[PDB]
Design an enzyme around this catalytic site. Structure first.
Site, PDB file in Angstrom:
ATOM      1  N   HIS A 350       0.825  -1.238   0.000  1.00  0.00           N
ATOM      2  CA  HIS A 350       0.000   0.000   0.000  1.00  0.00           C
ATOM      3  C   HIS A 350       0.847   1.270   0.000  1.00  0.00           C
ATOM      4  O   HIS A 350       0.265   2.338  -0.179  1.00  0.00           O
ATOM      5  CB  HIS A 350      -0.943   0.022   1.195  1.00  0.00           C
ATOM      6  CG  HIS A 350      -1.929  -1.093   1.232  1.00  0.00           C
ATOM      7  ND1 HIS A 350      -3.203  -0.927   0.778  1.00  0.00           N
ATOM      8  CD2 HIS A 350      -1.828  -2.355   1.706  1.00  0.00           C
ATOM      9  CE1 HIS A 350      -3.865  -2.054   0.944  1.00  0.00           C
ATOM     10  NE2 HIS A 350      -3.031  -2.958   1.504  1.00  0.00           N
ATOM     11  N   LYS A 541      -9.421  13.720   4.455  1.00  0.00           N
ATOM     12  CA  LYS A 541      -8.388  12.651   4.464  1.00  0.00           C
ATOM     13  C   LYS A 541      -7.472  12.930   5.653  1.00  0.00           C
ATOM     14  O   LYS A 541      -7.549  14.042   6.227  1.00  0.00           O
ATOM     15  CB  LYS A 541      -7.556  12.640   3.185  1.00  0.00           C
ATOM     16  CG  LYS A 541      -7.000  13.998   2.794  1.00  0.00           C
ATOM     17  CD  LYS A 541      -6.395  14.041   1.412  1.00  0.00           C
ATOM     18  CE  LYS A 541      -7.406  13.943   0.289  1.00  0.00           C
ATOM     19  NZ  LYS A 541      -7.230  12.718  -0.530  1.00  0.00           N
ATOM     20  N   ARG A 542      -6.647  11.958   6.028  1.00  0.00           N
ATOM     21  CA  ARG A 542      -5.717  12.160   7.165  1.00  0.00           C
ATOM     22  C   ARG A 542      -4.817  13.361   6.829  1.00  0.00           C
ATOM     23  O   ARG A 542      -4.517  13.588   5.638  1.00  0.00           O
ATOM     24  CB  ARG A 542      -4.991  10.850   7.484  1.00  0.00           C
ATOM     25  CG  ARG A 542      -5.889   9.788   8.112  1.00  0.00           C
ATOM     26  CD  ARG A 542      -6.340  10.180   9.506  1.00  0.00           C
ATOM     27  NE  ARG A 542      -5.215  10.353  10.428  1.00  0.00           N
ATOM     28  CZ  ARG A 542      -4.736   9.408  11.225  1.00  0.00           C
ATOM     29  NH1 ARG A 542      -5.268   8.199  11.238  1.00  0.00           N
ATOM     30  NH2 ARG A 542      -3.719   9.679  12.024  1.00  0.00           N
ATOM     31  N   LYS A 547      -0.069  14.752   1.300  1.00  0.00           N
ATOM     32  CA  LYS A 547      -1.436  14.971   0.771  1.00  0.00           C
ATOM     33  C   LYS A 547      -1.650  16.473   0.514  1.00  0.00           C
ATOM     34  O   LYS A 547      -2.700  16.835  -0.111  1.00  0.00           O
ATOM     35  CB  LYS A 547      -2.446  14.393   1.764  1.00  0.00           C
ATOM     36  CG  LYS A 547      -2.426  12.877   1.903  1.00  0.00           C
ATOM     37  CD  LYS A 547      -3.350  12.377   3.016  1.00  0.00           C
ATOM     38  CE  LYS A 547      -3.288  10.883   3.241  1.00  0.00           C
ATOM     39  NZ  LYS A 547      -4.078  10.145   2.231  1.00  0.00           N
ATOM     40  N   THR A 649      -8.774   6.439  -2.081  1.00  0.00           N
ATOM     41  CA  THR A 649     -10.140   5.890  -2.266  1.00  0.00           C
ATOM     42  C   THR A 649     -11.198   6.956  -2.035  1.00  0.00           C
ATOM     43  O   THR A 649     -12.295   6.806  -2.616  1.00  0.00           O
ATOM     44  CB  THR A 649     -10.335   4.649  -1.408  1.00  0.00           C
ATOM     45  OG1 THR A 649     -10.042   5.017  -0.068  1.00  0.00           O
ATOM     46  CG2 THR A 649      -9.463   3.523  -1.910  1.00  0.00           C
ATOM     47  N   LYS A 653     -14.896   7.946  -3.953  1.00  0.00           N
ATOM     48  CA  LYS A 653     -16.152   8.206  -3.273  1.00  0.00           C
ATOM     49  C   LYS A 653     -16.822   9.445  -3.863  1.00  0.00           C
ATOM     50  O   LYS A 653     -18.030   9.472  -4.106  1.00  0.00           O
ATOM     51  CB  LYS A 653     -15.917   8.374  -1.773  1.00  0.00           C
ATOM     52  CG  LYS A 653     -15.385   7.140  -1.067  1.00  0.00           C
ATOM     53  CD  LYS A 653     -14.865   7.437   0.325  1.00  0.00           C
ATOM     54  CE  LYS A 653     -14.056   6.305   0.867  1.00  0.00           C
ATOM     55  NZ  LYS A 653     -13.576   6.611   2.211  1.00  0.00           N
TER      56      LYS A 653
HETATM   57  O1  KV5 Z   1      -4.894   0.960  -0.395  1.00  0.00           O
HETATM   58  C1  KV5 Z   1      -5.650   1.752   0.536  1.00  0.00           C
HETATM   59  C2  KV5 Z   1      -4.951   3.048   0.894  1.00  0.00           C
HETATM   60  O2  KV5 Z   1      -3.822   2.704   1.722  1.00  0.00           O
HETATM   61  C3  KV5 Z   1      -3.127   3.851   2.207  1.00  0.00           C
HETATM   62  C4  KV5 Z   1      -2.051   3.395   3.144  1.00  0.00           C
HETATM   63  C5  KV5 Z   1      -0.806   3.011   2.783  1.00  0.00           C
HETATM   64  N1  KV5 Z   1      -0.154   2.667   3.903  1.00  0.00           N
HETATM   65  C6  KV5 Z   1      -0.995   2.876   4.943  1.00  0.00           C
HETATM   66  C7  KV5 Z   1      -0.676   2.604   6.345  1.00  0.00           C
HETATM   67  C8  KV5 Z   1      -1.699   2.604   7.292  1.00  0.00           C
HETATM   68  C9  KV5 Z   1      -1.428   2.307   8.596  1.00  0.00           C
HETATM   69  C10 KV5 Z   1      -0.115   2.008   9.022  1.00  0.00           C
HETATM   70  C11 KV5 Z   1       0.207   1.701  10.370  1.00  0.00           C
HETATM   71  C12 KV5 Z   1       1.486   1.418  10.734  1.00  0.00           C
HETATM   72  C13 KV5 Z   1       2.518   1.431   9.781  1.00  0.00           C
HETATM   73  C14 KV5 Z   1       2.245   1.718   8.481  1.00  0.00           C
HETATM   74  C15 KV5 Z   1       0.924   2.009   8.062  1.00  0.00           C
HETATM   75  C16 KV5 Z   1       0.605   2.305   6.722  1.00  0.00           C
HETATM   76  N2  KV5 Z   1      -2.170   3.300   4.487  1.00  0.00           N
HETATM   77  C17 KV5 Z   1      -2.537   4.652   1.046  1.00  0.00           C
HETATM   78  O3  KV5 Z   1      -1.862   5.800   1.583  1.00  0.00           O
HETATM   79  C18 KV5 Z   1      -3.641   5.047   0.061  1.00  0.00           C
HETATM   80  O4  KV5 Z   1      -3.077   5.633  -1.115  1.00  0.00           O
HETATM   81  C19 KV5 Z   1      -4.476   3.843  -0.338  1.00  0.00           C
HETATM   82  O5  KV5 Z   1      -5.601   4.299  -1.084  1.00  0.00           O
HETATM   83  C1  PLP Z   2     -12.317   6.785   2.390  1.00  0.00           C
HETATM   84  C2  PLP Z   2     -11.779   7.320   3.646  1.00  0.00           C
HETATM   85  C3  PLP Z   2     -10.416   7.639   3.808  1.00  0.00           C
HETATM   86  C4  PLP Z   2      -9.404   7.517   2.705  1.00  0.00           C
HETATM   87  O1  PLP Z   2      -9.384   8.782   1.983  1.00  0.00           O
HETATM   88  P1  PLP Z   2      -8.151   9.235   1.044  1.00  0.00           P
HETATM   89  O2  PLP Z   2      -8.638  10.555   0.472  1.00  0.00           O
HETATM   90  O3  PLP Z   2      -7.946   8.138   0.013  1.00  0.00           O
HETATM   91  O4  PLP Z   2      -6.922   9.419   1.943  1.00  0.00           O
HETATM   92  C5  PLP Z   2     -10.007   8.101   5.027  1.00  0.00           C
HETATM   93  N1  PLP Z   2     -10.849   8.289   6.061  1.00  0.00           N
HETATM   94  C6  PLP Z   2     -12.136   7.978   5.939  1.00  0.00           C
HETATM   95  C7  PLP Z   2     -13.025   8.204   7.111  1.00  0.00           C
HETATM   96  C8  PLP Z   2     -12.643   7.487   4.742  1.00  0.00           C
HETATM   97  O5  PLP Z   2     -13.973   7.216   4.658  1.00  0.00           O
END
Ligand code: KV5
Ligand code: PLP
Ligand code: KV5
Ligand code: IMP
Ligand code: IMP
Ligand code: PLP
Lengths: 809, 809
Positions: A350, A541-542, A547, A649, A653
């Site tokens: 990811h 988004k986060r 971003k 994602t 949406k």
């Molecule tokens: O494929 C679904 C989405 O995954 C996201 C992602 C990647 N790595 C993480 C993540 C999350 C939690 C983690 C916790 C600990 C360590 C690494 C950690 C990495 N989240 C990515 O940024 C986004 O582009 C994708 O659309």
């Molecule tokens: C879909 C969703 C995300 C992922 O959004 P990105 O714009 O791809 O980072 C994060 N948080 C919530 C609550 C979502 O529903």
């Protein structure tokens, strides 16, 4: 009310009303005269849960008789959100429950608002897990979600003085009616100990035992009567644990802490012991369950009966754990066990961000999982022997491809362990899967080109259209029927309505209704007044540097400076909404939230601006707030630096829900633009190629500051305290980073972003053509259904056929 | 099967069967093909709980409309045991559920054995609370039990190598179907902080907040359709608690530890902070609830509407807390608030043992409850001013009566606080209440003679006859009907059957059946073979020096030495059974268990003894084991040193269930002997007067050792390692204590005990006369019903009339 919400039959409504009163009396032990909305929500939840039970028991029964290949989705995160509306939608119960509640004098929509989000994820990765469970059930796959029942999910975000404060997400306080405890299927998980070597092979001894107790949540398919299981493990201490007396009982909490709290970092690795315990705990309990099921169907058939999908590296220890069970307990030889492991396991990557990649210190694995470290070293030796044979003399390749990284501290590269131990490795959008083959996994690709696939991400059109945007669902169903909800590609039929005046009017009417409903939600819950006739510019988004919420902030300050310069000129009014949580320890993300609120404090109170520009920080962004704001959006901000957003994602949406996208050629944005046509998308900025060219010659932010007077003004406003009068230097860390240490090249995309934002305002002046472009986007959003994604996993990784055929009711 | 278990109507049985299958499906999410006995127990529990709900809602409703005076029973302990059989008995459902389960192919008795004891007490005091709740419901009193929902109750006792090991009582692991969480009635409780003094009086500020969440358990009356509430508080942290991030969430456990574990000490005070937190936590949450209810009926009427009964001093902080609320929050003047407090509160004293009396260090109250310490000092000053006015110049009286004890560390005497703050103080048997007036509370009696009462303890004949001994219940109901179950005095009618041959045969037959059933229970669950034709000599109660299990051990070793001396002489065969838990930190109690098992290891394996003498340690003595062994007993051992056992209640259980008593004139033994006649009781040993005479001249154990050759032999056996061959000196602490530091004068009662035990054996040789004496005991056991006890509390302390009149169904 509306057709896609199903029938309200007289017998159905009468039966729902009677079960609602039975649950209020017998389950909740309340009379109607002291019941609160919360009692009413719970009575409704128990009533709908009753319609799941028969379907859940029959589905699990059917899988025992048919013995199909089983899919195990291992994730540390499931971002589920609310269950009540989703269950009603998937069981065609929504109109019947609306009617039954209406006749008992209650408003079902007000009862839905009482449910807590299951916030057991950070964002995109956790929510992808949740969309996948829904698609696996809809496609009739014998699929199981396996994770951790965290007592506290992602923290509740409060803004105090424009700063993020974190509060514990006590989501279980009032109970969870959707889960069923299965204390009878409790399994032991081992930690610490040491390895003895005997005549009969290696033995893991003197371990500490934590119990894993499973909680089963039903996952209903879309009207196919299929109900799959999400099984989440809770940590419990054994009763002989620490067994002066009182302290021994109190110390049971050291063991139960394992499942206490979700780590709240999105795309950031923190090498903490408690996190490694969480990873082993879910993998160890899950593989015992997988193996128990398999033995109630020698190990040559395991991969014909079992697929294990790894959601990133977080459950990578599934690979050495399966070897440990097969070699140490079942007494298979190494080579046979390895064959079985590789054919069973598949790895979804990811991210490419280096600080997100899991690299566990060896001293940590040595103490906690001594046998797994031995097995990992053995995997590494045999893997490096195949590398040496294929690339003789290429010693640098051996160092680069090693599972063990040398240095200050030796680390295990868990990504390298997953590629070696998996028959399939996939990224999550075509450009991301290409970048894996060209950059971080180039060496692995050259060894085993066959392992590397793309599976472009998707979203479930159940939650993300029918559930959150029923009015849009309905005007679509008016023209083309209901079939599209489980076959989203059918939305292409909407291209024949792009010049239909009535359909143009209905699309614009639903958007306008969603904006009124959301403007009113802001007023009720957070006392803020927004112009619903303005363009709704949304970035949710986060909070992350990659971003580029900061790129958006620069645009907002540009519009403000342009208004102040020429106060009496027409500009398209905007409500600019930004929301998202920062990881509690992520200083720069906390500063960005504070800057957003500080811009708002200046822009929203300038009488010269009027209602032409508003900046709102959306508090506590979560799945249930996404269901409200995304249907209300006009403009989707997808403005990550090219190469950083693996997929996204959110982008999908918004495309489904009638917003136009302004974005970089990053992640699935590339595929969204290809599906809709570049002319129907607000593409700006550096491509991946341009970023690389800038990296080769060196990114000098000063160059952009010297050449763009509008940009220099903003940086001087930030520096001098224009936005922080009482603390002039509040934002010096932000300026200093933008000028000297910007990894994401914010200034490099500034000019093209503002110009492209002018093109957005210009099209928004022409409602009819804006709406015609919206229709072209909704119409081509079909590819981005998680049903397409899962059908691709099933056929190209798991070796199973999806099915849209119903189980009997 | 039997009449007192109620009707099995065709409609009733059909309805129970249908609800059992509905709960198995919908509640437990099990099909019949994977259900375990535990699933079946749970389905039955949910089915019976359904019959409570209507009655519970109506009863609470009735109390809101009628607004009667409310009784609040505050206890840190409720020793409830199992709920399923008790609920069925009180709702007349037992035969209908037996029939309904039989027709579904299940054995209800096997399902009952799956329920965990609610072990939220140590012994007599916790179980008295449980008997009282049952009697308050049966007598239609608007009564509430208030305590703590401990996550771990009294530890599970394992014997390993003859030693006690403790295991955590994880009684909630599989869930508790009897409790209903009421998270909506969650209340704040304050700790630490400091007192500010303002113009508007004292303010308690900068406190730490723990939340108290209530769990309601139904308490059904005997067939009167009354269901009262036991409300137990759970500690929960607030969500801003400690709010780096992860550690703040993990540290929520410091707050929740308050309700984690029952302190496992019977008649032993341990001045620990966590225990003081438990005491304040239940008192603070409970008084807010009492006051909320009262304000939904100025404070002059509080005592006409509220009685608070204090179960010992454990909730003594109710007195200063009520003052704090009335003075600091409601702004009543001191004198008015004090009047209300005294008229509201009543104190039950349960012990005279000095090491059991609660004396809290001032530095502890100063840190944790600063305002309560100020209020206690103010109470002490005004109390000592009344003492000085009544007894002018009597300065020693002032020191003795003070709530504050001077010394190394200043302590609060919580007993002194309860007498000062209560309109009524009672002991729990006539001799105990006399000893309170002559010794520890003499000074208080001379000031306020009117406050001091006796309320002799009782037991509920529902659990302790109908439930545990249905066969005895039935042969009684054959002669005199069912009315006695709620009017135990009616058992006097059995004196007209003392020469009835058929009744003699039926009493002996039921005893013999109970002995066969218990002998078989020993074989199944603990692989031990007992002669069911032997005399069942039973001592079950907590292991304590004052209860003189050691006196019993000396008798057992005497019988053994007498057999070995004259192997070929006839002796009445006995099974000697001793059971009870020792407090984990109580060294001497742990040695006594080990001695009991060590005697067993010698006696049970001597082939010369044969089946003439058996010594069994009954493992994990608890309410559910008491229900099995007490109906099986022939001889009840109640052999506490005169003046040490305040009442006892075990004694009463055995009298009701057809065992003769060997005991000292201690506690309720005196009243039991008076009711039955001294000639129908095996009375031996020093009276209180004799113990005092021995104390004046000095207890010299050596004197008894020099004069009784049989005793000297035993002490020499113990010393030399006769009972511990591998560890010769294992029992030197026991010998050393018996010879030099025996507070309970074991040797002083030895000769009279053995002689009296010979009289027991002699009567056991004559079955008919043994049975005629048993009938005289059962026949006069009426006084020892908790219905009599509670009717006395109601009329003479609380100012309410009991009622046997039924609520409608
Ligand atoms: O494929 C679904 C989405 O995954 C996201 C992602 C990647 N790595 C993480 C993540 C999350 C939690 C983690 C916790 C600990 C360590 C690494 C950690 C990495 N989240 C990515 O940024 C986004 O582009 C994708 O659309
Ligand atoms: C879909 C969703 C995300 C992922 O959004 P990105 O714009 O791809 O980072 C994060 N948080 C919530 C609550 C979502 O529903
Ligand atoms: O009235 C019911 C029975 O109460 C018993 C009792 C007295 N004190 C305690 C006790 C229990 C728990 C404690 C915990 C902490 C401190 C003191 C603690 C005292 N228990 C008493 O010994 C017995 O004679 C009675 O029959
Ligand atoms: O021995 C069995 N007999 C009949 N059904 C079974 C048996 N084992 C499992 N099942 C069914 O298979 C389901 C799935 O169980 P699981 O795979 O162990 O979670 C169970 O809930 C039952 O419905
Ligand atoms: O305002 C009220 N209206 C009607 N019934 C009430 C009200 N307040 C309490 N009750 C009833 O009184 C019961 C006892 O509530 P409690 O005394 O607060 O535990 C409730 O469960 C209701 O049945
Ligand atoms: C009744 C009872 C007691 C109290 O017995 P005493 O002989 O009065 O000490 C203790 N434990 C249990 C389990 C009881 O049922």
């Amino acid at each position: 009310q509306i057709s896609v919400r199903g029938l309200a039959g007289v017998e159905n409504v009468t039966e729902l009303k009677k079960n609602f009163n039975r649950h209020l009396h017998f389950t909740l032990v309340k009379d109607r005269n002291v019941a609160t909305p919360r009692d009413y929500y719970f009575a409704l939840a128990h009533t709908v849960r009753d319609h799941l039970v028969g379907r859940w028991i029959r589905t699990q029964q059917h899988y025992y008789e048919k013995d199909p290949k089983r899919i195990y989705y291992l994730s540390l995160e499931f971002y589920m959100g609310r269950t009540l509306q989703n269950t009603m939608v998937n069981l065609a119960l929504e109109n019947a429950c609306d009617e039954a509640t209406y006749q008992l004098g209650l408003d079902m929509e007000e009862l839905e608002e009482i449910e807590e989000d299951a916030g057991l994820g950070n964002g995109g990765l956790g929510r992808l897990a949740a969309c996948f469970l829904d698609s696996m059930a809809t496609l009739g796959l014998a699929a199981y979600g396996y994770g951790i029942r965290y007592e506290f999910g992602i923290f509740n975000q409060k803004i105090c003085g424009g700063w993020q404060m974190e509060e514990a997400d006590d989501w279980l306080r009032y109970g969870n009616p959707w889960e069923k405890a299965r204390p009878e299927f409790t399994l032991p998980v081992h930690f610490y100990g040491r390895v003895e070597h005997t005549s009969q092979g290696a033995k893991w001894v003197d371990t500490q035992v934590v119990l894993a107790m499973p909680y089963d949540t039903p996952v209903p398919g879309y009207r196919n009567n299929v109900v799959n299981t999400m099984r989440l493990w809770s940590a419990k201490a054994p009763n002989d644990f620490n067994l002066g007396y009182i302290q021994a009982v109190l110390d049971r909490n050291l063991a139960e802490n394992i499942s206490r709290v979700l780590y709240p970092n999105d795309n950031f690795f923190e090498g903490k012991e408690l996190r490694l315990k969480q990873e082993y705990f879910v993998v160890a309990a899950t593989l015992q369950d997988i193996i128990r099921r398999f033995k109630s169907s020698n190990f040559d058939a395991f991969p014909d009966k079992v697929a294990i999908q790894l959601n990133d590296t977080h459950p990578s220890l599934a690979i050495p754990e399966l070897m440990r069970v097969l070699v140490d307990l079942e007494r298979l030889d190494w080579d046979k066990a390895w064959e079985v492991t590789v054919k069973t396991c598949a790895y979804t990557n990811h991210t490419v961000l280096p600080e997100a990649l899991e690299r566990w210190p060896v001293h940590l694995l040595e103490t906690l999982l001594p046998r797994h470290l031995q097995i990992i070293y053995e995997i590494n030796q045999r893997f490096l022997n195949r590398v040496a044979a294929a690339f003789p003399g290429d010693v640098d390749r051996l160092r680069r491809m090693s599972l063990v990284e040398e240095g200050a501290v030796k680390r295990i590269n868990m990504a390298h362990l997953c590629i070696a131990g998996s028959h399939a490795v996939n990224g999550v959008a075509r450009i991301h899967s290409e970048i894996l083959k060209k950059t971080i996994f180039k060496d692995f690709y050259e060894l085993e080109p066959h392992k590397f696939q793309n599976k472009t991400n998707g979203i479930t059109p159940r939650r993300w259209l029918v559930l959150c945007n029923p009015g849009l669902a309905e005007i679509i169903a008016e023209r083309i029927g209901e079939e599209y909800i489980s076959d989203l590609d059918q939305l292409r039929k909407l291209l024949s309505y792009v010049d239909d005046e009535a359909f143009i009017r209905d699309v614009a009417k639903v958007k306008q209704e969603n904006k009124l409903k959301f403007a009113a939600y802001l007023e009720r819950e957070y006392k803020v007044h927004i112009n619903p006739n303005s363009l709704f510019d949304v970035q949710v988004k986060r909070i992350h540097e990659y971003k580029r919420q900061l790129l958006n902030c620069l645009h907002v300050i540009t519009l403000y400076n342009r208004i102040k310069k020429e106060p009496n000129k027409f500009v398209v009014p905007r409500t600019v909404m930004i929301g998202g949580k920062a990881a509690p320890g992520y200083h720069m993300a906390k500063m960005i939230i504070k800057l957003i609120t500080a811009i708002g404090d200046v822009v929203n109170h300038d009488p010269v601006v009027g209602d032409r520009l508003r900046v709102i920080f959306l508090e506590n962004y979560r799945v249930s707030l996404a269901e409200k704001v995304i249907p209300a959006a006009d403009l989707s901000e997808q403005i990550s630096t090219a190469g950083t957003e693996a997929s996204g994602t959110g982008n999908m949406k918004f495309m489904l829900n009638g917003a136009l996208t302004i974005g970089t050629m990053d992640g699935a944005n590339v595929e969204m633009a290809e599906e809709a046509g570049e002319e129907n998308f607000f593409i700006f900025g550096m491509r991946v190629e341009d970023v690389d060219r800038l990296d080769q010659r060196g990114y000098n932010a000063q160059e952009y500051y010297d050449r763009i007077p509008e940009l220099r003004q903003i940086i001087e406003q930030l520096s001098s305290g224009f936005f922080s009068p009482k603390q002039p230097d509040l934002f010096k860390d932000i300026v200093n980073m933008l000028m000297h240490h910007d990894r994401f090249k914010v200034f490099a995309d500034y000019e093209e972003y503002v110009k492209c934002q002018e093109r957005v305002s210009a099209l928004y002046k022409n409602p009819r053509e804006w709406t015609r472009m919206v229709i072209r986007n909704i119409a081509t959003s079909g590819k981005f259904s998680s049903d397409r994604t899962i059908a691709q996993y099933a056929r190209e990784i798991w070796g199973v056929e999806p099915s849209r055929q119903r189980l009997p009711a």
